[PDB]
């Protein structure tokens, strides 16, 4: 997250931190995710496509810090890793960038709700907030271009949803952005998601209810003028989500 605020997991209790265990036993941070039901985390296919081996991955819930333990945190393996079969990647754009992770503890248990672990509601069919709506993003991703390490403390920021019309303008993303994607950015280009925030939540208050409107997918640079964050439009993928869970 470029700009924004350091946060804590109780302010973002659906947030999932996903790591990969490497040959050699070192663990690196991969991407964010969102808990949509006790057994299911939702994220982005591009986070896993080059290493589709589910035993590699560690999922944490209730975690506020990248490399330190948080009181009440819970650790999970991936019982099932479901990548979207029509996923593809262009020079900038990623398509069908959505993934599901069925999680279980070593005891075989799914998430147990607490002050620091809760589910986030899915949107209803083809129902998104209006352009100009303020929404939040959360992640452990880069804070600055020059970062070579991710931040230790979880971060959040607030960005505004941008119309498909505006996002398709030639100095924006032209026809590379589609109606299955949502753009969001800071009017002053000061705050944005960035590398490492992919797969994490874009949360909007929709009918008074915290809703998972988007999943961090792509963008040219980070907080770059005329280059919004692009998010998987969760409301389009409900049939896919329903049929796979």
């Amino acid at each position: 997250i470029i700009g924004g605020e350091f946060t804590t997991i109780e302010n973002q209790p659906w947030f999932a931190a996903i790591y990969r265990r490497h040959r050699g036993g070192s663990v690196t941070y991969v991407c964010g995710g969102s808990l949509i039901s006790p057994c299911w985390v939702i994220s982005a296919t591009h986070c896993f496509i080059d290493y589709p081996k589910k035993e590699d991955y560690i999922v944490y819930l209730g975690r506020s810090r990248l490399n330190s333990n948080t009181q009440g945190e819970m650790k999970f393996e991936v019982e099932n890793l479901i990548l979207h079969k029509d996923y593809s990647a262009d020079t900038l754009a990623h398509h069908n960038d959505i993934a599901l992770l069925k999680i279980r503890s070593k005891e075989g248990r799914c998430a147990q709700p607490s002050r620091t672990i809760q589910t986030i509601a899915l949107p209803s069919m083809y129902n998104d907030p209006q352009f100009g709506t303020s929404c939040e993003i959360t992640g452990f991703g880069k804070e600055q271009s020059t970062d070579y390490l991710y931040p230790e403390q979880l971060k959040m920021t607030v960005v505004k949803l941008i119309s498909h019309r505006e996002c398709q303008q030639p100095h924006y993303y032209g026809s590379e952005v589609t109606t299955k994607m949502l753009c969001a950015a800071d009017p002053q280009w000061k705050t944005d998601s960035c590398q490492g925030d992919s797969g994490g939540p874009l949360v909007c208050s929709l009918q008074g209810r915290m809703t998972l409107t988007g999943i961090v997918s792509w963008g040219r640079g980070c907080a770059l003028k005329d280059k919004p964050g692009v998010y998987t439009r969760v409301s389009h993928f409900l049939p896919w989500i329903r049929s796979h869970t």
Binding site: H46, C47, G229
Partner: peptide, 14 residues
């Protein structure tokens, strides 16, 4: 080739 930033986490090409 593969771009940097969001989209290219956990990739050989990154």
């Amino acid at each position: 080739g593969x771009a940097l930033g969001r989209g290219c986490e956990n990739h050989r090409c990154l």
